[PDB]
Coordinates of C-alpha atoms and ligand atoms in Angstrom, one line a residue:
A25 CA 7.2 23.2 1.6
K26 CA 5.6 20.3 3.8
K27 CA 7.3 17.4 5.9
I28 CA 5.4 14.4 5.2
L29 CA 5.4 10.8 6.7
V30 CA 3.5 8.1 4.7
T31 CA 3.5 4.7 5.7
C32 CA 1.8 1.5 4.3
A33 CA 0.9 -1.4 6.7
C34 CA 3.8 -3.8 7.6
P35 CA 3.5 -7.0 5.5
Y36 CA 3.3 -10.3 7.5
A37 CA 6.9 -12.0 7.3
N38 CA 5.6 -15.4 6.5
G39 CA 3.4 -14.9 3.4
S40 CA 4.0 -14.0 0.0
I41 CA 3.0 -10.6 -1.5
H42 CA -0.3 -10.8 -3.6
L43 CA -2.2 -8.2 -5.6
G44 CA -4.1 -7.3 -2.4
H45 CA -0.9 -6.0 -1.1
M46 CA 0.1 -4.4 -4.0
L47 CA -3.5 -2.5 -4.2
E48 CA -2.1 -0.5 -0.6
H49 CA 1.4 -0.2 -1.7
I50 CA 0.5 1.0 -5.3
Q51 CA -2.2 3.4 -3.7
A52 CA 0.4 5.1 -1.3
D53 CA 3.2 4.8 -3.9
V54 CA 1.2 7.0 -6.4
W55 CA 0.1 9.8 -3.9
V56 CA 3.7 9.6 -2.5
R57 CA 5.1 10.6 -6.2
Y58 CA 2.4 13.3 -6.6
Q59 CA 3.8 15.0 -3.4
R60 CA 7.3 14.5 -4.3
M61 CA 6.2 16.4 -7.5
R62 CA 4.9 19.2 -5.8
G63 CA 8.4 20.0 -3.9
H64 CA 7.6 18.8 -0.4
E65 CA 9.8 16.6 1.9
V66 CA 8.3 12.9 1.9
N67 CA 9.4 10.0 4.0
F68 CA 7.9 6.9 2.6
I69 CA 8.5 4.1 5.2
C70 CA 7.4 0.5 5.6
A71 CA 8.5 -2.6 6.9
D72 CA 8.2 -6.8 7.3
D73 CA 6.1 -7.5 10.3
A74 CA 8.3 -10.4 11.6
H75 CA 7.7 -11.5 15.1
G76 CA 4.8 -14.2 16.5
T77 CA 4.2 -17.8 17.4
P78 CA 3.3 -18.9 14.0
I79 CA 6.5 -17.5 12.5
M80 CA 8.6 -19.1 15.5
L81 CA 6.8 -22.6 14.8
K82 CA 7.1 -22.2 11.0
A83 CA 10.9 -21.7 11.5
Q84 CA 11.1 -24.8 13.8
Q85 CA 9.4 -26.9 11.1
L86 CA 11.6 -25.8 8.4
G87 CA 14.9 -26.2 10.8
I88 CA 16.5 -22.8 10.8
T89 CA 16.2 -20.1 12.7
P90 CA 13.5 -17.5 12.6
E91 CA 16.0 -14.8 11.8
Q92 CA 17.1 -16.7 8.7
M93 CA 13.5 -17.1 7.8
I94 CA 12.1 -13.6 8.1
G95 CA 15.4 -12.4 6.5
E96 CA 14.6 -14.4 3.3
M97 CA 11.2 -13.5 3.2
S98 CA 11.9 -9.7 3.7
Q99 CA 14.2 -10.2 0.8
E100 CA 11.7 -11.7 -1.2
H101 CA 9.1 -9.0 -0.3
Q102 CA 11.8 -5.9 -1.0
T103 CA 12.2 -7.8 -4.6
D104 CA 8.6 -8.0 -5.3
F105 CA 7.7 -4.3 -4.4
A106 CA 11.1 -2.9 -6.4
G107 CA 9.6 -4.8 -9.3
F108 CA 6.5 -2.6 -8.7
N109 CA 8.7 0.3 -8.2
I110 CA 7.2 1.2 -4.7
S111 CA 9.3 4.1 -3.9
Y112 CA 10.1 3.5 -0.2
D113 CA 12.7 5.9 1.7
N114 CA 13.1 3.0 4.0
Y115 CA 12.0 -0.6 4.2
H116 CA 13.0 -2.0 7.8
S117 CA 11.9 -4.9 10.2
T118 CA 9.9 -5.1 13.3
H119 CA 12.7 -7.6 14.5
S120 CA 15.3 -4.5 14.6
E121 CA 17.5 -2.9 18.0
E122 CA 15.4 0.4 16.6
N123 CA 12.2 -1.4 17.5
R124 CA 13.5 -3.0 20.4
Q125 CA 14.2 0.3 21.9
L126 CA 11.4 2.0 21.0
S127 CA 9.1 -0.9 22.2
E128 CA 10.5 -0.8 25.7
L129 CA 10.5 3.0 25.8
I130 CA 6.7 3.0 24.8
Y131 CA 6.0 0.4 27.2
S132 CA 8.0 1.9 30.1
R133 CA 6.1 5.3 29.7
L134 CA 2.5 3.6 29.5
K135 CA 3.6 1.7 32.8
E136 CA 4.8 4.7 34.6
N137 CA 1.7 6.6 33.5
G138 CA -0.9 3.7 35.0
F139 CA -2.0 2.7 31.5
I140 CA -0.7 -1.2 32.1
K141 CA -3.2 -3.7 34.1
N142 CA -1.9 -6.7 35.2
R143 CA -4.5 -9.9 34.9
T144 CA -4.2 -13.5 35.0
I145 CA -5.9 -15.3 32.1
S146 CA -6.7 -19.1 31.4
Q147 CA -5.8 -20.5 28.2
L148 CA -5.1 -24.0 26.5
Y149 CA -1.5 -25.3 27.0
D150 CA 0.3 -28.1 25.2
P151 CA 1.9 -29.6 28.0
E152 CA 4.4 -31.9 25.9
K153 CA 5.5 -29.1 23.6
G154 CA 5.2 -27.0 26.8
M155 CA 3.5 -23.6 25.1
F156 CA 0.3 -21.9 25.1
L157 CA -1.4 -22.5 22.3
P158 CA -3.3 -20.0 19.8
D159 CA -6.9 -21.1 19.1
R160 CA -5.6 -22.2 15.4
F161 CA -3.5 -24.3 16.8
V162 CA -6.0 -26.6 18.5
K163 CA -8.4 -29.1 17.0
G164 CA -10.9 -31.1 17.7
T165 CA -14.4 -32.5 17.0
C166 CA -17.2 -29.8 16.8
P167 CA -19.6 -29.7 19.9
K168 CA -22.8 -29.2 18.1
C169 CA -22.3 -31.4 15.1
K170 CA -19.7 -33.9 16.2
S171 CA -17.6 -33.5 12.8
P172 CA -13.9 -34.4 13.3
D173 CA -10.9 -32.4 12.4
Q174 CA -12.2 -28.7 13.0
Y175 CA -9.5 -26.2 13.7
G176 CA -9.8 -22.8 16.4
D177 CA -13.1 -21.5 17.1
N178 CA -15.7 -22.3 14.4
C179 CA -16.8 -25.6 12.4
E180 CA -16.1 -25.7 8.7
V181 CA -19.0 -28.0 8.2
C182 CA -22.0 -27.0 10.5
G183 CA -20.6 -23.5 10.5
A184 CA -20.9 -22.9 14.6
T185 CA -18.7 -20.9 16.4
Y186 CA -17.7 -21.9 19.9
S187 CA -14.7 -21.4 22.2
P188 CA -12.0 -23.6 21.5
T189 CA -12.5 -25.3 25.0
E190 CA -15.7 -26.6 23.8
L191 CA -13.8 -28.7 21.4
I192 CA -14.3 -32.4 21.6
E193 CA -11.3 -34.6 22.1
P194 CA -9.0 -31.5 21.6
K195 CA -5.3 -32.1 20.4
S196 CA -2.4 -29.5 20.0
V197 CA -1.8 -29.1 16.3
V198 CA 1.7 -28.8 17.0
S199 CA 2.5 -32.2 19.1
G200 CA -1.1 -33.7 19.2
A201 CA -0.9 -33.8 22.9
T202 CA -4.2 -33.2 24.7
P203 CA -3.9 -29.5 25.9
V204 CA -4.8 -28.4 29.2
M205 CA -6.1 -25.1 30.8
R206 CA -3.6 -23.0 32.5
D207 CA -3.1 -19.7 34.0
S208 CA -1.0 -16.9 33.1
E209 CA -0.3 -13.5 34.3
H210 CA -0.8 -11.1 31.4
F211 CA -0.1 -7.4 30.8
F212 CA -3.0 -5.2 29.5
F213 CA -3.4 -1.9 27.8
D214 CA -6.0 0.6 29.1
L215 CA -7.4 1.6 25.9
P216 CA -10.8 2.6 27.7
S217 CA -9.2 5.3 29.2
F218 CA -8.5 7.1 26.1
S219 CA -12.5 6.8 24.6
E220 CA -13.1 10.8 25.1
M221 CA -10.1 11.5 23.1
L222 CA -10.8 9.0 20.5
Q223 CA -14.3 9.9 20.0
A224 CA -13.2 13.5 19.6
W225 CA -11.0 12.3 17.0
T226 CA -13.7 10.5 15.3
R227 CA -15.9 13.7 15.4
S228 CA -13.1 16.0 14.0
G229 CA -14.1 15.2 10.2
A230 CA -10.6 14.2 9.4
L231 CA -11.3 10.8 8.6
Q232 CA -13.6 9.1 6.1
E233 CA -16.8 9.1 6.8
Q234 CA -17.2 5.3 6.2
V235 CA -14.5 5.0 8.7
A236 CA -15.9 7.2 11.4
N237 CA -19.2 5.6 11.0
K238 CA -17.8 2.4 12.1
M239 CA -15.9 3.8 14.7
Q240 CA -19.0 4.6 16.4
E241 CA -20.3 1.2 16.2
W242 CA -17.2 0.2 18.2
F243 CA -18.0 2.8 20.8
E244 CA -21.3 1.8 21.4
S245 CA -20.1 -1.9 22.0
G246 CA -17.8 -0.4 24.4
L247 CA -13.9 -0.2 24.3
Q248 CA -11.8 -3.2 26.2
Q249 CA -8.4 -3.6 27.6
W250 CA -6.1 -5.3 25.2
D251 CA -3.4 -8.2 26.2
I252 CA 0.1 -6.8 24.9
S253 CA 1.9 -9.8 26.2
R254 CA 2.7 -13.3 25.6
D255 CA 4.4 -16.1 27.2
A256 CA 7.9 -17.8 26.3
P257 CA 8.7 -19.6 24.1
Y258 CA 7.9 -16.7 21.8
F259 CA 10.0 -14.9 18.7
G260 CA 9.7 -11.4 19.8
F261 CA 10.8 -8.8 22.5
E262 CA 11.2 -9.8 25.9
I263 CA 9.5 -7.6 28.3
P264 CA 12.2 -5.6 30.7
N265 CA 11.7 -6.9 34.3
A266 CA 9.2 -9.6 33.5
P267 CA 11.3 -12.8 33.2
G268 CA 9.4 -15.3 30.5
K269 CA 6.9 -12.6 29.0
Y270 CA 7.3 -11.2 25.5
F271 CA 5.6 -8.3 23.9
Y272 CA 2.8 -9.2 21.7
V273 CA 2.9 -8.3 18.2
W274 CA 0.1 -5.8 18.7
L275 CA 2.5 -3.6 20.6
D276 CA 5.7 -3.6 18.7
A277 CA 4.1 -3.7 15.3
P278 CA 3.0 0.0 14.4
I279 CA 5.9 0.6 16.5
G280 CA 7.9 -0.7 13.7
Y281 CA 6.6 2.5 11.7
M282 CA 8.8 4.5 14.0
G283 CA 11.5 2.2 14.2
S284 CA 12.0 2.3 10.6
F285 CA 12.1 6.2 10.4
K286 CA 14.7 6.2 13.0
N287 CA 16.6 3.5 11.3
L288 CA 16.4 5.9 8.1
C289 CA 17.8 9.0 10.3
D290 CA 20.6 6.9 11.9
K291 CA 21.7 5.7 8.7
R292 CA 21.7 9.3 7.3
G293 CA 23.6 10.7 10.3
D294 CA 20.5 12.9 10.7
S295 CA 20.0 13.5 14.7
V296 CA 17.3 15.9 14.5
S297 CA 14.4 14.5 12.1
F298 CA 13.4 11.7 14.3
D299 CA 11.9 14.2 17.2
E300 CA 11.0 16.5 14.7
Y301 CA 8.3 13.9 13.3
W302 CA 7.0 12.1 16.3
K303 CA 7.4 14.5 19.1
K304 CA 4.0 16.0 20.2
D305 CA 5.0 19.7 18.9
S306 CA 5.4 18.4 15.4
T307 CA 4.3 20.6 12.6
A308 CA 5.2 17.4 10.2
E309 CA 2.4 15.4 8.6
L310 CA 2.0 11.3 9.5
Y311 CA -0.4 9.3 7.4
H312 CA -1.2 5.7 7.2
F313 CA -2.2 3.7 4.3
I314 CA -4.2 0.6 5.9
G315 CA -6.8 -1.8 4.7
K316 CA -10.3 -2.3 6.3
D317 CA -9.0 -5.1 8.7
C318 CA -6.4 -2.8 10.3
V319 CA -9.0 0.4 10.7
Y320 CA -9.8 -0.7 14.8
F321 CA -6.1 -1.2 15.2
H322 CA -4.9 1.6 13.6
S323 CA -8.0 4.3 14.5
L324 CA -8.3 3.4 18.1
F325 CA -5.2 1.1 19.9
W326 CA -2.5 2.9 17.8
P327 CA -3.4 6.8 18.8
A328 CA -4.0 5.5 22.4
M329 CA -0.4 4.3 22.6
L330 CA 1.2 7.0 21.0
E331 CA -0.7 9.7 23.6
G332 CA 0.0 7.5 26.7
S333 CA 3.6 7.5 26.0
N334 CA 4.0 11.1 24.9
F335 CA 4.2 11.1 20.9
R336 CA 2.4 12.9 18.4
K337 CA -0.4 11.0 16.9
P338 CA -1.5 10.0 13.1
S339 CA -2.7 13.3 11.1
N340 CA -5.0 11.0 9.3
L341 CA -5.8 7.3 7.9
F342 CA -6.4 6.7 4.4
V343 CA -8.3 3.3 4.2
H344 CA -8.8 1.5 1.1
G345 CA -10.8 -2.0 0.4
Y346 CA -10.3 -5.3 -0.7
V347 CA -9.3 -6.4 -4.0
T348 CA -11.7 -8.7 -5.8
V349 CA -10.9 -10.9 -9.1
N350 CA -13.5 -11.5 -11.6
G351 CA -15.7 -10.0 -9.1
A352 CA -15.0 -12.4 -6.1
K353 CA -12.8 -12.8 -3.7
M354 CA -9.4 -14.1 -4.7
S355 CA -9.8 -18.1 -5.4
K356 CA -6.9 -20.6 -5.4
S357 CA -8.7 -23.2 -7.0
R358 CA -9.8 -20.7 -9.8
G359 CA -6.2 -19.3 -9.9
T360 CA -7.3 -15.7 -9.3
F361 CA -5.0 -15.6 -6.1
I362 CA -2.4 -14.4 -7.8
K363 CA 1.2 -13.3 -6.1
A364 CA 3.0 -10.2 -7.4
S365 CA 6.1 -12.0 -8.4
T366 CA 3.9 -14.3 -10.8
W367 CA 2.0 -11.0 -12.2
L368 CA 5.4 -9.6 -13.1
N369 CA 6.4 -13.1 -15.1
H370 CA 3.3 -12.2 -17.6
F371 CA 2.9 -8.4 -17.3
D372 CA 4.6 -5.2 -16.4
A373 CA 4.2 -3.0 -13.2
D374 CA 2.6 -0.2 -15.1
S375 CA -0.4 -2.0 -16.4
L376 CA -1.4 -2.9 -12.8
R377 CA -0.7 0.5 -11.5
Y378 CA -2.9 1.9 -14.2
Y379 CA -5.7 -0.5 -13.6
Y380 CA -5.9 0.1 -9.9
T381 CA -5.2 4.1 -10.2
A382 CA -8.1 3.9 -12.7
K383 CA -10.6 2.5 -10.1
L384 CA -9.4 4.0 -7.0
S385 CA -11.3 6.8 -5.1
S386 CA -11.2 8.3 -1.7
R387 CA -13.9 5.9 -0.4
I388 CA -13.2 2.3 1.2
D389 CA -15.2 0.3 -1.4
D390 CA -13.7 -2.9 -2.7
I391 CA -11.5 -2.7 -5.9
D392 CA -12.2 -5.5 -8.5
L393 CA -9.8 -6.2 -11.1
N394 CA -11.9 -7.5 -13.9
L395 CA -9.3 -9.5 -16.0
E396 CA -11.3 -8.9 -19.3
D397 CA -11.5 -5.6 -18.5
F398 CA -7.7 -5.1 -17.9
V399 CA -6.9 -6.1 -21.4
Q400 CA -9.5 -3.8 -22.6
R401 CA -8.8 -0.9 -20.9
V402 CA -4.9 -1.3 -21.0
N403 CA -5.2 -1.4 -24.7
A404 CA -7.4 1.3 -25.1
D405 CA -6.0 4.0 -22.3
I406 CA -2.4 3.6 -22.1
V407 CA -1.6 2.5 -26.0
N408 CA -4.5 4.1 -28.4
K409 CA -4.9 7.1 -26.3
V410 CA -1.8 8.3 -24.8
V411 CA 1.0 6.4 -25.6
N412 CA -1.0 6.8 -29.7
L413 CA 0.1 10.7 -29.3
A414 CA 3.7 9.9 -29.2
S415 CA 3.9 7.1 -31.6
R416 CA 1.6 8.3 -34.6
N417 CA 3.7 11.8 -34.4
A418 CA 7.6 11.1 -33.6
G419 CA 8.3 9.0 -37.1
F420 CA 7.7 11.9 -39.5
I421 CA 9.4 14.2 -37.2
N422 CA 12.5 12.0 -36.5
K423 CA 12.1 10.9 -40.4
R424 CA 11.5 14.2 -42.2
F425 CA 12.4 17.0 -39.7
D426 CA 16.1 15.9 -38.3
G427 CA 14.2 15.2 -34.8
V428 CA 13.3 18.8 -34.5
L429 CA 10.1 20.1 -33.1
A430 CA 8.3 23.4 -34.4
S431 CA 9.4 26.5 -33.2
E432 CA 5.7 27.7 -32.2
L433 CA 2.5 25.9 -30.8
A434 CA 0.2 25.2 -33.8
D435 CA -2.8 25.6 -31.2
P436 CA -1.9 27.5 -28.4
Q437 CA -5.8 27.7 -27.2
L438 CA -5.8 23.6 -27.3
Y439 CA -2.3 23.6 -25.1
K440 CA -3.7 26.1 -22.4
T441 CA -6.8 23.7 -22.3
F442 CA -4.4 21.0 -21.5
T443 CA -2.2 23.0 -18.7
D444 CA -5.5 24.7 -17.2
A445 CA -6.2 21.6 -16.2
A446 CA -3.8 20.8 -13.9
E447 CA -5.2 22.3 -10.8
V448 CA -8.3 19.8 -11.0
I449 CA -6.0 17.1 -11.6
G450 CA -3.6 17.5 -9.0
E451 CA -6.3 18.4 -6.9
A452 CA -7.8 15.0 -7.6
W453 CA -4.2 13.2 -6.9
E454 CA -4.3 15.1 -3.6
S455 CA -7.3 14.1 -2.2
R456 CA -7.0 10.6 -3.4
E457 CA -9.6 10.6 -6.1
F458 CA -7.2 8.8 -8.4
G459 CA -10.2 7.7 -10.6
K460 CA -11.5 11.5 -11.3
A461 CA -7.9 12.1 -12.1
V462 CA -7.7 9.4 -14.8
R463 CA -11.1 10.4 -16.2
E464 CA -9.8 14.1 -16.5
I465 CA -6.6 13.0 -18.0
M466 CA -7.9 10.5 -20.5
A467 CA -10.5 13.0 -21.2
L468 CA -7.7 15.5 -22.3
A469 CA -6.0 12.2 -24.3
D470 CA -9.2 12.1 -26.3
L471 CA -9.3 15.9 -26.9
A472 CA -5.5 15.5 -28.1
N473 CA -6.3 12.6 -30.9
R474 CA -9.4 14.4 -31.9
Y475 CA -7.4 17.5 -32.6
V476 CA -4.6 14.9 -34.7
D477 CA -7.4 13.2 -36.4
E478 CA -8.7 16.7 -37.5
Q479 CA -5.8 17.4 -39.0
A480 CA -4.9 14.3 -40.4
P481 CA -1.4 13.8 -40.7
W482 CA -1.5 10.7 -42.8
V483 CA -2.8 13.4 -45.6
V484 CA -0.6 16.1 -45.1
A485 CA 2.3 13.9 -45.5
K486 CA 1.9 12.9 -49.1
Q487 CA 0.7 16.6 -50.5
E488 CA 3.2 18.5 -51.8
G489 CA 4.6 21.5 -50.1
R490 CA 3.0 21.0 -46.8
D491 CA 6.1 20.0 -44.9
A492 CA 5.8 23.1 -42.8
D493 CA 2.0 22.1 -41.7
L494 CA 3.0 18.3 -40.8
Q495 CA 6.1 19.6 -38.6
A496 CA 3.4 21.8 -36.8
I497 CA 0.6 19.1 -36.6
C498 CA 3.0 16.4 -35.4
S499 CA 5.0 19.0 -32.8
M500 CA 1.4 19.7 -31.3
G501 CA 0.7 16.1 -30.7
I502 CA 4.0 15.5 -29.2
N503 CA 3.6 18.7 -26.8
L504 CA 0.1 17.3 -25.7
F505 CA 1.8 14.1 -24.9
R506 CA 4.3 15.8 -22.8
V507 CA 1.5 17.4 -20.7
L508 CA -0.3 13.9 -20.3
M509 CA 2.7 12.2 -19.2
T510 CA 3.5 14.7 -16.7
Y511 CA 0.0 14.2 -15.2
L512 CA 0.3 10.4 -15.2
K513 CA 4.0 10.5 -13.9
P514 CA 2.9 9.2 -10.3
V515 CA 1.0 6.3 -12.2
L516 CA 3.4 5.0 -14.7
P517 CA 6.9 5.4 -13.5
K518 CA 8.8 2.9 -16.1
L519 CA 6.7 4.6 -19.2
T520 CA 7.5 7.8 -17.7
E521 CA 11.1 7.2 -17.7
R522 CA 10.8 6.1 -21.7
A523 CA 9.1 9.3 -22.2
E524 CA 11.5 11.4 -20.7
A525 CA 14.4 9.5 -23.2
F526 CA 12.3 10.0 -26.0
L527 CA 11.4 13.9 -25.3
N528 CA 15.1 14.7 -23.9
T529 CA 13.5 16.3 -20.8
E530 CA 12.6 15.6 -17.1
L531 CA 9.1 15.8 -16.6
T532 CA 8.2 18.4 -13.8
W533 CA 4.6 19.4 -13.1
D534 CA 5.3 23.3 -13.3
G535 CA 7.3 22.5 -16.8
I536 CA 4.2 22.1 -18.6
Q537 CA 3.9 26.1 -18.8
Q538 CA 6.8 26.0 -21.2
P539 CA 6.3 23.8 -24.3
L540 CA 9.2 22.2 -26.0
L541 CA 10.1 24.4 -29.1
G542 CA 12.9 24.2 -31.6
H543 CA 13.5 21.1 -29.8
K544 CA 15.4 18.0 -30.3
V545 CA 13.5 14.5 -29.5
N546 CA 14.9 11.2 -30.0
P547 CA 13.7 8.0 -31.8
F548 CA 12.6 4.9 -29.8
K549 CA 11.3 1.2 -30.5
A550 CA 8.1 0.6 -29.0
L551 CA 6.7 2.5 -25.7
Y552 CA 4.3 0.1 -25.1
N553 CA 3.0 -2.8 -26.6
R554 CA -0.8 -4.1 -26.6
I555 CA -1.8 -7.1 -24.2
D556 CA -4.5 -10.0 -24.9
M557 CA -6.7 -12.3 -23.3
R558 CA -4.0 -15.6 -24.0
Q559 CA -1.6 -13.9 -21.3
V560 CA -4.5 -13.3 -18.9
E561 CA -5.1 -17.4 -19.5
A562 CA -1.4 -17.9 -18.9
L563 CA -1.4 -15.9 -15.7
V564 CA -4.4 -17.7 -14.1
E565 CA -3.0 -21.1 -15.4
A566 CA 0.2 -20.3 -13.7
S567 CA -1.3 -19.3 -10.4
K568 CA -3.5 -22.8 -9.9
Ligands
LIG601 C1 1.7 -2.1 11.5 S1 0.7 -2.7 10.5 C2 0.6 -4.6 10.5 C3 -0.2 -5.1 9.5 C4 -0.3 -6.7 9.7 N1 0.7 -7.4 9.4 C5 -1.8 -7.3 9.4 C6 -1.5 -7.1 7.6 O1 -0.3 -7.2 7.3 O2 -2.4 -7.4 7.2
LIG602 ZN1 -19.8 -28.4 13.7

């Protein structure tokens, strides 16, 4: 009955999708697929984050327009996400007419409401290229240790940190010219004006405990005004009435959430839903799946912007931790910085979806992809527990009973144990306690395989006159498989499709209350094959 708008953070348009991205998009997709299974109206929304100085400069280096460049990466991103079956209702771009009009609207409202301040700043400027330089486009000699060729505000030899104005003999990364300090008028969003409102939200108990605790540190330090403007040359949206000024990516990037939803509504011919979801009186729910590095932005700056422009605010933020590989930050030299596209050359999407889901919880803890454990857990849980219930039983049904399952359950008590678990498993999906859900599902899978072991179909099959017993045992196992695959349907979309083809039925959450009786199933080849460490070694080598 609910109306739900769910987002993932907008991926940066000048980088390939990697396993870190995939943790976020898989987490959101599992939750979204479960919400759809319970009958709610869900809109799963994302976009590419396509503006800014680095993108402008990279396009110039490539000799193409920024529009061509961001279009190519957007296609690359959506191909990768589609390969992992991330079920977006719309994937748009921050570089769109919808986002331009919404950015201009929100800015004009913030300005009229008194939340935009004008302030002159001083910044390093490349007089040959003719542009202000972000910190990382200034290089020079460390003022402390005198090591040359250091970038930005820190030295990678001695570890010192400093303003780039302290670099000795500074050079523009763009042109090699010596930069100089230049003044420019910038426009600032008066975030401090919203501190009391934001502190109330922090205390409300909606946010994760770990996020609320961190926000208290930020309030203690003191909220600051945030620069929302950039000087030309720039790739982005020009500020009305302010020639030569552009909106900084901070402003237009989250508005891209709104622009993507407006684009979806407009493409559908739906003239009511945008206001239904974004007006202040909305009864729809708005959720953002984000990582730790995006929490300050989504928990303070973004709700303040929405409040100041008369829009509704997020219902909640769902924050996940970083991905590690073999216990450590991804390492290019070790081959553990793994692109999504590369992953799919070696493994399927379901394997990573399952492994992440088994490790995820409602907390912000980092998620470790241990590659040895990945092989063991996928083979143990998917091949040998869940799929085993189908593969060990289907052959007898197809070959000796014409594909027809028994007309009654052999063990109705055991079946009720499986269906009785739906409430706790569903609540685990709902609360984002994914690891809890998987633990209960695999505990049931162990029960199901213990049942089959106890009945010993490999013995019954050879014994004269026991055809009825064999059909009963094998049909019971297949009905337990039906239930487990329903509980796993949000996690494993492609295996589920193969399971539905075998079972000759769509898997619905409520359907488990009616077992398959006197029901024809189809043959299948192999629902899910084993993986091995040679494949992991090939993935690592291909990523170096
Ligand atoms: C509106 S969400 C914007 C997210 C930024 N692109 C940061 C990131 O993708 O890591
Ligand atoms: Zn140094």
